[PDB]
C-alpha cells in the first residue's frame, strides 16, 4: 500500500502555536505592432531587468556593483537580441503556413543562426 504525506505538518493547528464595441482578435495586435515599432523606448521594465542581472551575475562574482549605464547597456543589448530573434521566429513561422510563433519555431531559428 503506497502512502504519501501532504500536510507536511507533524501537528495540526500550527497557527495557534507559540512559535460594447470590441475589435476582432488581431486588429489591436497590429495597432500595437505599429505602436511598438514606431517607438524606441525600452520595453522590459528596468528594475525588474536590473534585478535579473544582479541575481545572475552573483554567480560569476559576488559584490559586483554595476554602473547604471551598464544595466542600461544590458537592457538595450537584450532587447536588441530578442527583437532580432523574434523577427527570425516570425519568419520561421510564416514559413510553415502559420501565424503563431511557437517554442519550436525558436529552437530552430537559433539552430540556423548557429547560436546553438
Amino acid at each position: 500500500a503506497r502512502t504519501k504525506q501532504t500536510a507536511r505538518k507533524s501537528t495540526g493547528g500550527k497557527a495557534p502555536r507559540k512559535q460594447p464595441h470590441r475589435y476582432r482578435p488581431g486588429t489591436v495586435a497590429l495597432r500595437e505592432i505599429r505602436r511598438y515599432q514606431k517607438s524606441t523606448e525600452l520595453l522590459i521594465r528596468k528594475l525588474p531587468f536590473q534585478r535579473l542581472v544582479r541575481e545572475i551575475a552573483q554567480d560569476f562574482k559576488t559584490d559586483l556593483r554595476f554602473q547604471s549605464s551598464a544595466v542600461m547597456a544590458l537592457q538595450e543589448a537584450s532587447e536588441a537580441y530578442l527583437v532580432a530573434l523574434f523577427e527570425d521566429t516570425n519568419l520561421a513561422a510564416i514559413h510553415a503556413k502559420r501565424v503563431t510563433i511557437m517554442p519550436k519555431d525558436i529552437q530552430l531559428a537559433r539552430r540556423i543562426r548557429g547560436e546553438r
Binding site: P48, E55, A57, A70, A73, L74, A80, L82, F86, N90
Partner: protein, 79 residues
C-alpha cells in the same frame, strides 16, 4: 524568480516590436531561458574584463566590450 520578473506582457511587447501577431503560450517560458543563457554569457565576459581591471564594479564600457567580443557591437554607450 528574478527571472520570472521578465513578465509575460513584457515578452509580448518584445514580440510586438518583433512583428509577431500571435504568441504561443509556451513561448513566454522559452524566452526566459534563452534570455538568461545569453545574459549569462555577456555578463560573464563583462566580469572577466572587470576582474582584469581589478575593478570590483562593472562598467557599461566593460559591457559593450563583452558585446564586442561576442560579436554584437553596441553603439551608444561608449567606446
Amino acid at each position: 524568480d528574478n527571472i520570472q520578473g521578465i513578465t509575460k506582457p513584457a515578452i509580448r511587447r518584445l514580440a510586438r516590436r518583433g512583428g509577431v501577431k500571435r504568441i504561443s503560450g509556451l513561448i513566454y517560458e522559452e524566452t526566459r531561458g534563452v534570455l538568461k543563457v545569453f545574459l549569462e554569457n555577456v555578463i560573464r565576459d563583462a566580469v572577466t574584463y572587470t576582474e582584469h581591471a581589478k575593478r570590483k564594479t562593472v562598467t557599461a564600457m566593460d559591457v559593450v566590450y563583452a558585446l564586442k567580443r561576442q560579436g554584437r557591437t553596441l553603439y551608444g554607450f561608449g567606446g
